Every structure is written in C-alpha cells, then in structure tokens.
Amino acid sequence: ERPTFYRQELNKTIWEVPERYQNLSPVGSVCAAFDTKTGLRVAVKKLSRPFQSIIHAKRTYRELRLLKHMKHENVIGLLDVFTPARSLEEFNDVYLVTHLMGADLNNIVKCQKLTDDHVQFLIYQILRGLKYIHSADIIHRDLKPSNLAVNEDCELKILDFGLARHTTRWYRAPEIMLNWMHYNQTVDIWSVGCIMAELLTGRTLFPGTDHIDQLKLILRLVGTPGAELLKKISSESARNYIQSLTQMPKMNFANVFIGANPLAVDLLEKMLVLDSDKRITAAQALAHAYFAQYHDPDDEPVADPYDQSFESRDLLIDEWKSLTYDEVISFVPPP
C-alpha cells in the first residue's frame, strides 16, 4: 500500500516524501530526517533532474544497480528508495535513503595531526571497503574525505563509489590529470595515499588552486615520468606533451613525512608511485605490516559477480527511466 506523501519546499527545491520521514533538514540534494519506523536518523537524497539527460538517466540507473548489489560493512547501504509517482508515466523523481552517520572525514580532520593508531584504523577500513568494491570490477574514481563517513567511534562507510566518471582534484591520480589513454583500479589507491598523508600531517598533500598548479605539486613529489613509463605512451603527441613538463626528480618520502611511523612512510611510497602498473593494490595494501593489528584475511570479503553489461549500452532516456522504475518497484528493504 502506497504510504501518504507530504510536500515541502527546502532551499527552493520541492521535497515530496512518505510521512514516515520527519523533520527534514538540509545537510542531488541531501536532507537528514527522522525515520518514524525505527527511531533512527536517516540521510534522504533527492536526485537532481534524474531523467532530463542521457548522462543523468544512466547515472540514476547505475546508482540504484550499485546500491542494490553492494553489501559490506565499510560501504554505505540502501535503506529505502521511493518516488511520489504512482505510475511509469508520472515517474520523474527518485529519492534514496541511507543511515545518517556522525560526520564526514573532512570536519573530523580539518588541520588535525591524528595519532598513528587512529590513522591505521581509518585507512584499514577504507582499504577493506575498496578491496570489496574493486573485486566487483568497480572503481570509486572520486575517493575524498567528503565521501568517507564516520560514526562517533570511527567506524567508516564509503559513499558514492562507482558513480562518477571523469565527466576537488586534490586526490586525483596523475594519470587522470594527464589524461592517459587507460587507467586501472589503483587510481583509488593514489586517493587513499593522499588521504593517509593528510591524516598523518594535518595538511593537504597536493593543494593546487588550478589544473597546472595541481600537476606541478604532484610531479615535484613523485617526479616526472621516467624512461620506462614514457615507453608506455601509445601516441606521439601525448608522448611529446609529457616531455614538455619541466623535469623533476622523485623525492624521498622519509624526509617529507618527518616523524611518521616508518611503516606508514613505506606504505605511502607504495601508494604514491607515478607508474599505475607498479602501484600497490587494496588487497596487497591490507597485507602490509602497517595494518598488522587489524589485518585478518578471513574477514576481508570479496563481492558477488556484478553484471554491468548496461555500462556498454547507448539507450534512450525513456529506456533508462523504465529500467530504473523496475529497480524501484522490485526493491526489498533490508531486515
């Protein structure tokens, strides 16, 4: 039976939600709400114009397919998905509900020089969630402190994984900033390295104010590409653009992160390698000695196979919209 919906206007946007969700407060657009069925606080996301472009329509479907197929302690879970629409013809709005967390990594870390055990615990949970996500052949692509939510005791959940496509920039792998012809899952490991460096020092590792500055800040630490990496460039113009870059030697990290745990420095060296092929994976990083006090190979699960044949499809907005409506109708809330 269709619950009763109520309408309200928050910051010039109309929100139409079941009466179950009370006291909506702005935090797609996101509101914190009180779930009257459980007595818990929830985050309700209203997707912005979900079916007004092919990009939006496919991203809407993608979000729902990722959320319905991904179950892990360090990955956000879907509590509810709803629409005020009573039929496919009137289906134009989609709302997604998750648990509301205590805070996002950003506010917790704002120029904070965290303790080593705190860093270990946070990074371990990010890598545990990434191992799982990567095992389903999904790349987060935009991992940053703002999409890493933590409760009051530092238990972490990864948000928005697999959604974005290279359409901040402080956490973006150099191969994306240089627009290399291909990239792998370790694009997320570069982001982990940047977040870990920041947790250890209380400073953003690469705070560029523009694209040119960003590349200069990255390459002055990791160095310009060597002879071995240069050979991996398929085209002459790309190869020639790469050589036009100033020329910088790779810096020693023990010097940059003075006073950090040496195992933390050693792990940062393996995450912040310019050559994507030599960068440590999430599963390999979990086995690193820095995480000796958290690592358990029997409690770092992999994901079930994920059918993403839809990603190669070029469908009309109405087709993406009908596929999304089928996923909304078939949704079964977790117990």
Ligand SMILES: CCCNC(=O)c1cn2ncnc(Nc3cc(C(=O)Nc4ccon4)ccc3C)c2c1C
């Ligand atoms: C200020 C209090 C601390 N902050 C929070 O608790 C919090 C902030 N947010 N912001 C956006 N989405 C959230 N959750 C959310 C996340 C997703 C999501 O991650 N979607 C996808 C798409 C692909 O993979 N995951 C979808 C819908 C929602 C409400 C969310 C939560 C929980």
